[PDB]
Every structure is written in structure tokens, then in C-alpha cells.
Amino acid sequence: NRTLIVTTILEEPYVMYRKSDKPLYGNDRFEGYCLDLLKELSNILGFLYDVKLVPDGKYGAQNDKGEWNGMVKELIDHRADLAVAPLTITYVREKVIDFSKPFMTLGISILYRKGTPIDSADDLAKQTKIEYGAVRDGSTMTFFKKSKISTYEKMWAFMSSRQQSALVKNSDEGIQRVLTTDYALLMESTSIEYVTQRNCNLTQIGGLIDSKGYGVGTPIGSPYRDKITIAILQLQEEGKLHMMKEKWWRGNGCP
Ligand SMILES: N[C@@H](C[C@]1(C(=O)O)C[C@H]2OCCC[C@H]2O1)C(=O)O
């Protein structure tokens, strides 16, 4: 009857600080898609838990020494029983940790101002006037860093160049950069949808350049590993995941 440690990260509208004049403590301090998800899992599988924000505020990437950081690291060193956040399922990650069936699908795309002639990653990679980058130490950064596709290698050379600092610490910083300067942020599509519907001067440029999903993470060889995936299929089957997405993404839109 262990009380599980859940590693996660701040990211709208997956995990956010609950607004209240009543100083909150514990898991009550947070709310969002992922917390509703963790709550469902908690009830479907009957387990206790304590939400812990990843110390370094990173999603997780492997440096030069093959050393991991972020939530991925927290799982590897068994400092967390599971990770419940917008954690991207990737091949390189599956080498060191486990992922449940996906609870949400998405893909890398481009967030930029509207009304410009830019229409694709190619239009971005061929030029240098418009600055562009991604969140440091995330699956999108490594996608470009390790790509063998000519276009993306050229983009990585630009966003990682010494001439400048094209990468951003987190999504907020990236978004602010797009709104105040001539910058395009390569970001995952479900967040681009969220951001553009709340910033009508912004838009997605082109379509998704890859296709993947978010899954619950657990240390390889975890006893919960199978139950988690079962509960996910149940939530998906019952239309529950769809309801949760709609609940947190609902808004006035752009007209
Ligand atoms: N899902 C990524 C993190 C991130 C990315 O590297 O694209 C950063 C953050 O960017 C905004 C959308 C949610 C997050 O995606 C990951 O699991 O590493």
C-alpha cells in the first residue's frame, strides 16, 4: 500500500498551479489534464500518490556522456514510480524506460505569426532572417539534433549555432519570444492548438512533421506497468480521454 511518487512538470493546460486565496498544500496545489488523468488512474487501479515537480524542470534528454536528466532521469534512478505529464514516447527513450499505450496523439509543428508567406519547415530552413528554435532538452530538440534529414540537419545547425541563442528554457519563454520578436517556435501540435486559440495573431505553419503520442512513464520492469496501460485503454474506450481533452482545451476560439 505504498504511496507512489509521481514526477511531472509545469505545462499548460496539463499541469498548473490552482488559483485560490486559500493557501493550498499537497496535490491540491495542482490541476489540469494530467492531474485529472492521474486521478482517474488512482481510482481505476486504487493507489495513493504524491505529485513531485521534476527538480531540474526538464523533460529529459541524454547529454554527451549518455547521461539523462529531467523526468526520464527521475524514473531511471527510481526516484519516481511513474511520470504523468505531456511526456513524448520516443524510440531512444524506450531504451531506458517504459511507456503506456498513448493517452494523446500529436506531432511536431511550427508556431508563428500569421499573415506571412512562410508555409513550411523548408521555408524556415532555407532562410535565416526569421529566427527559430525549440525547448531545450526535450524530444523536439533531440528530434532535430539527431535527424538525418537534410532539411532538419540544416535547421539544427541554425538553432544550435554559436552566432546566437535560438533555444528556449521552456514553452512560455518560447511563446513570449514568438509574440515579441520575429521568431517561430517548433512545438508539439496539441499545445500549438491551445496557444493559437488564445492568441489570434498566431497560427500553425504547415502540418505535423512527425506523428507520435504521450504516454505514462514507469521504470522499466514496473509492477504497475501493465495495469496502467489497461486503465488507459478503458478510459479511451469509455470516451473519457476525449472528454478530458475537450474540458481543458475548450475556449472562445478565434474570429
Ligand atoms: N513533449 C516533449 C517536451 C516538449 C517538446 O520538446 O516538444 C516541450 C514542451 O513544449 C510545449 C508542448 C509540450 C512540451 O513538448 C517531451 O516529452 O520531451
Side-chain angles (χ1 to χ4, degrees), residues 11 14 59-60 71 86-89 93 106 108 134-135 137-141 170-171 185-188 190-192 214:
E11 188 75 57
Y14 298 95
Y59 277 89
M71 291 177 287
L87 189 63
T88 306
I89 303 169
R93 283 181 169 170
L106 55 126
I108 296 172
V135 170
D137 285 0
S139 64
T140 295
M141 179 205 77
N170 51 60
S171 74
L185 178 75
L186 274 103
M187 170 184 1
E188 301 189 317
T190 37
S191 289
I192 287 181
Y214 294 144

Side-chain angles (χ1 to χ4, degrees), residues 140-187:
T140 295
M141 179 205 77
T142 91
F143 171 83
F144 282 95
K145 184 177 182 179
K146 297 309 174 183
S147 179
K148 292 289 172 289
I149 304 296
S150 177
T151 302
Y152 308 146
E153 295 181 306
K154 194 179 183 184
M155 288 178 76
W156 176 244
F158 176 85
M159 70 188 82
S160 71
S161 65
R162 318 208 313 135
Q163 301 191 67
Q164 55 181 65
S165 178
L167 299 185
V168 297
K169 190 179 64 176
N170 51 60
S171 74
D172 266 340
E173 180 179 313
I175 299 169
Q176 278 304 297
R177 193 159 178 177
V178 171
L179 295 170
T180 63
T181 66
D182 199 2
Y183 180 82
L185 178 75
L186 274 103
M187 170 184 1

Side-chain angles (χ1 to χ4, degrees), residues 25-166:
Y25 291 77
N27 306 336
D28 294 311
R29 300 168 295 169
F30 313 113
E31 64 171 47
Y33 181 92
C34 283
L35 281 110
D36 282 4
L37 171 61
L38 179 55
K39 289 188 181 183
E40 280 298 341
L41 290 174
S42 181
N43 297 163
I44 305 289
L45 299 66
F47 64 75
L48 298 173
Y49 64 82
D50 179 46
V51 175
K52 284 269 172 290
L53 293 179
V54 62
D56 66 28
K58 289 176 170 294
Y59 277 89
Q62 180 164 60
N63 65 37
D64 214 310
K65 312 178 195 301
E67 212 151 57
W68 292 85
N69 53 25
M71 291 177 287
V72 177
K73 179 63 172 176
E74 292 306 297
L75 283 179
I76 298 178
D77 297 348
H78 285 58
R79 281 198 288 294
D81 298 285
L82 37 46
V84 173
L87 189 63
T88 306
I89 303 169
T90 69
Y91 176 80
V92 67
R93 283 181 169 170
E94 294 180 308
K95 288 296 192 193
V96 295
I97 62 170
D98 277 310
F99 286 112
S100 67
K101 283 294 196 177
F103 56 80
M104 183 178 301
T105 59
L106 55 126
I108 296 172
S109 197
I110 306 171
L111 173 68
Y112 189 56
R113 60 183 63 177
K114 47 175 62 171
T116 80
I118 286 71
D119 215 64
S120 71
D122 222 76
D123 298 335
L124 226 46
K126 81 205 302 178
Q127 60 88 62
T128 177
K129 179 165 186 168
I130 314 295
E131 279 176 30
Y132 57 87
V135 170
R136 189 181 285 84
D137 285 0
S139 64
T140 295
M141 179 205 77
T142 91
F143 171 83
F144 282 95
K145 184 177 182 179
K146 297 309 174 183
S147 179
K148 292 289 172 289
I149 304 296
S150 177
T151 302
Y152 308 146
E153 295 181 306
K154 194 179 183 184
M155 288 178 76
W156 176 244
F158 176 85
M159 70 188 82
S160 71
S161 65
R162 318 208 313 135
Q163 301 191 67
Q164 55 181 65
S165 178

